[PDB]
């Protein structure tokens with residue numbers, strides 16, 4: 018049961034984060050959608066009812082993230098779960114022979130900044146807020162769930178920046194779970210294959226449905242012994258160049 | 259929901275398999291406990307009621323496994339789910355200086371035979387039975403779940419035979435999911451850390467509870483996009499020598 | 500330098516084991532080719548000269564492997580390096596549609612027996628012989644090198660038996676290095692992609708040359724800090740179903 | 741043989757990079773040490789003789805890196821090998837409860853900038869220079885070796901920023917090898933355990949010697965089929981929290 022838990026979901030105005038908010042609110046939880054101001058955040062939070070609110074913030078900004086977390090804790094009293102779905106992608110080769118073009122340093126830095134530095138920024142600030150909760154009967158104070166990708170393991174031609182950012186999330190999953198063990202905060206990462214959001218797959222032979230990602234997030238929230246691990250959700254695909 | 263599904267659970271008279279049967283029968287499924295004749299399978303199946311029966315069989319025998327699957331079908335009409343939990347262990351070094359003793363070939367063989375060959379024997383025979391089912395709305399005919407171990411990744415001193423056996427389960431998970439993709443049978447492996455069955459864990463700091471392994475099996479049966487993957491269930495532990 | 504070292508190479512009459520023997524004998528080492536009686540062992544050993552002999556033995560037999568190691572120690576005085584290249588393969592689906600044929604238990608059993616049980620049998624017996632050597636200046640008494648495959652990570656359709664046998668070699672690499680640490684024996688595993696022995700590779704775009712596997716074996720023998728690890732040698736290929 | 745090859749080595753004034761330059765120049769290659777102005781680069785380059793020069797540059801600056809690569813090409817004629825060893829480390833928890841301290845965003849950003857963004861900056865600019873070379877007989881134009889760490893797989897308490905930076909190097913290794921396949925440039929990554937540079941390990945039981953990392957670099961340069969892979973060099977250690 019997720020009934021009564023309070024969750025903050027980055028990238029909550031669209032695709033995987035939105036579908037995660039719809040499932041948890043439908044099971045009795047409260048959700049805060051953290052997304053940029055020009056998104057559809059406000060009207061999705063209105064459609065979802067009085068137990069879902071919108072908080073505008075860019076995940077690379079310390080000040081905007083801090084204000085969104087303060088808002089959640091005042092509206093709902095505490096924070097129990099955080100899910101990181103905010104992210105961007107590009108498709109640019111390291112070096113393109115035919116156009117004789119070199120990947121810019123600025124396009125690499127931008128993808129690292131939103132995807133990897135932005136996910137650590139949310140984790141570092143939300144951990145101190147969860148630390149304020151009273152431990153449940155098993156010593157737990159919170160759960161943090163991150164979104165990597167199968168490109169951390171089989172990155173394709175044109176994915177060097179994206180793959181570097183997602184491999185960085187995979188790499189920090191264990192040390193962050195070991196750091197937060199003493200205060201009872203579990204840290205788990207999901208790595209999606211190809212999903213239908215804004216025939217290579219063995220079975221089922223189709224794009225993933227965002228509601229299948231949401232079901233896996235609920236399982237992770239409910240199981241108390243899952244921690245410091247990365248789980249592939251991809252219909253058994255292995256990516257080719 | 260697992261309501262109305264039919265599941266065969268090897269090693270179902272004790273520990274992880276028994277706890278899995280309790281959970282699935284309590285959610286409305288039917289369960290067949292496949293375990294050795296001298297186990298307590300019969301009285302555990304009686305305690306769970308009319309939707310749980312016992313089928314005595316050794317997983318290394320072709321004839322006994324076939325007769326157990328024929329019984330399940332005769333009684334319940336079909337097979338939807340199979341869970342492999344039957345397994346044994348030894349603690350013997352490859353070579354022990356102190357007593358000048360080499361590990362015997364016979365003790366390695368026995369562990370491989372029960373753990374790895376017995377798991378493939380159940381997989382090959384149950385696939386033909388699941389292949390008889392009409393596909394659901396998503397093209398699925400069944401789900402097979404195996405039990406490996408964190409020893410497939412950090413085997414300790416004395417675990418060479420056990421690690422070989424569980425490393426073989428990990429290695430065959432993807433080729434078996436690729437083989438059974440055309441008929442809609444998913445194949446997923448769970449790798450448990452230390453569990454309380456017949457100080458080192460980061461969080462929670464205790465042995466796992468068998469009911470936590472059962473909850474993970476139920477969520478693997480429910481999520482349609484999880485396939486060809488291995489999932490660690492271990493409290494974030496990493497084993498030392 | 501491998502000059503003067505004594506090596507036993509299983510599967511030495513052909514392909515990767517033969518090419519390994521040619522390189523090491525070329526650099527001043529002595530080699531013993533362990534392979535079945537019906538192979539070309541004897542004439543390859545004669546072509547390579549007086550520092551290369553043939554010892555007929557099936558790796559699944561305790562008695563014949565023991566006799567081959569006794570011959571090597573008798574003839575050359577000691578054993579410093581062991582290389583496991585003996586192996587077989589099959590292409591059989593777990594359950595085959597068009598012919599309605601289930602994978603036999605006997606075909607799975609035979610691949611496991613030669614590839615995984617036969618590699619452990621050589622390891623266990625050669626460790627005691629290496630243990631007889633006086634330690635060098637860095638405390639080392641020997642080095643054991645095994646041959647797995649990229650099929651341990653991306654097994655294809657029809658590779659379930661082979662993948663299981665090679666995943667078991669990967670799984671036991673670390674516990675066996677941990678077991679043999681106290682007497683100074685290093686244990687490393689190589690995982691080849693596709694080699695030219697009896698267009699999908701990124702670069703170089705061709706099958707591997709057996710002489711490239713032999714160069715990597717020499718590098719492993721010479722580097723003192725490489726231990727308990729698996730190395731892919733494959734042109735950056737990742738296998739599709 | 742590396743005789744005649746021209747290598748650019750970042751972080752070449754100290755530790756792993758310096759030992760690598762010593763070995764390669766000793767075998768007849770030419771080396772360019774790329775390191776910061778405050779280092780001892782100039783006097784190490786002078787001690788090694790006329791086939792070793794110093795080029796002051798910060799890897800985070802594309803103007804300084806471009807000027808260093810231009811100096812190497814004009815002085816020696818071409819660039820055949822690039823080794824990335826430049827790197828820094830910090831030991832700071834994500835959150836510390838007793839002192840109520842949150843990891844700063846700036847300290848995480850700094851480590852990502854030098855270790856991950858600086859390595860991609862060197863890779864993107866050196867690739868175009870290697871592309872100018874005439875392909876050898878096997879179609880190769882160059883080789884790029886990166887330095888990650890065992891902290892990409894077992895990060896400890898306090899290593900969240902360092903682990904994220906090294907996990908990013910691991911994750912981009914395959915997409916960069918796939919990108920550069922068409923022009924014959926191999927891309928491989930080494931992951932060192934604990935080394936004696938400016939108790940525990942199974943065997944040998946000691947810190948690694950920088951000369952052992954240099955020997956592995958040479959073998960990666962000489963083997964033509966090693967590509968898109970990560971190799972652990974750590975005495976079989978597995979890191980605890």
Ligand SMILES: NC(=O)c1ccc[n+]([C@@H]2O[C@H](COP(=O)([O-])OP(=O)(O)OC[C@H]3O[C@@H](n4cnc5c(N)ncnc54)[C@H](O)[C@@H]3O)[C@@H](O)[C@H]2O)c1
Nearest residue numbers: 028031032033052053075076102103104209211212214215
């Ligand atoms: N759809 C797929 O196939 C897929 C596959 C693998 C991984 N992913 C990952 O899943 C996550 C969700 O992606 P999605 O498919 O739902 O995409 P999406 O575009 O539909 O949703 C991502 C949301 O993140 C928000 N966002 C972007 N930059 C932000 C910033 N700086 N601050 C705050 N919000 C920001 C966007 O505005 C958007 O609403 C991402 O991390 C993505 O990399 C998606």
Ligand SMILES: NC(=O)c1ccc[n+]([C@@H]2O[C@H](COP(=O)([O-])OP(=O)(O)OC[C@H]3O[C@@H](n4cnc5c(N)ncnc54)[C@H](O)[C@@H]3O)[C@@H](O)[C@H]2O)c1
Nearest residue numbers: 269272273274293294316317344345407450452453455456
């Ligand atoms: N408990 C742990 O810490 C742990 C950790 C990792 C992996 N595992 C694995 O979990 C699985 C279940 O283990 P467990 O802890 O419940 O042990 P358990 O002893 O309680 O149960 C295992 C059951 O398997 C049955 N079994 C054994 N050999 C059999 C055979 N040849 N044919 C049929 N049934 C047979 C036994 O009779 C027993 O009832 C095993 O595969 C074990 O290797 C357990």
Ligand SMILES: NC(=O)c1ccc[n+]([C@@H]2O[C@H](COP(=O)([O-])OP(=O)(O)OC[C@H]3O[C@@H](n4cnc5c(N)ncnc54)[C@H](O)[C@@H]3O)[C@@H](O)[C@H]2O)c1
Nearest residue numbers: 510513514515534557558584585586648691693694696697
């Ligand atoms: N060639 C490839 O593409 C490739 C790729 C990956 C892994 N491998 C592995 O490389 C190893 C060598 O294979 P190869 O390509 O050189 O094949 P090969 O057929 O040319 O040589 C293998 C040798 O092992 C011997 N052998 C077989 N069964 C034996 C037994 N019971 N006892 C003793 N010797 C026995 C054979 O007689 C043969 O001489 C095998 O383990 C194989 O699985 C090969």
Ligand SMILES: NC(=O)c1ccc[n+]([C@@H]2O[C@H](COP(=O)([O-])OP(=O)(O)OC[C@H]3O[C@@H](n4cnc5c(N)ncnc54)[C@H](O)[C@@H]3O)[C@@H](O)[C@H]2O)c1
Nearest residue numbers: 751754755756775798799825826827889932934935937938
């Ligand atoms: N020593 C170990 O135990 C160890 C273990 C794992 C990985 N590593 C990695 O090995 C590599 C070599 O480290 P080391 O142990 O030899 O350390 P070191 O400090 O001895 O040498 C690294 C060098 O990098 C240079 N450097 C730092 N920042 C730079 C920048 N912005 N631009 C250019 N040069 C810069 C420094 O001036 C120094 O000379 C690093 O990437 C490190 O993370 C080391």
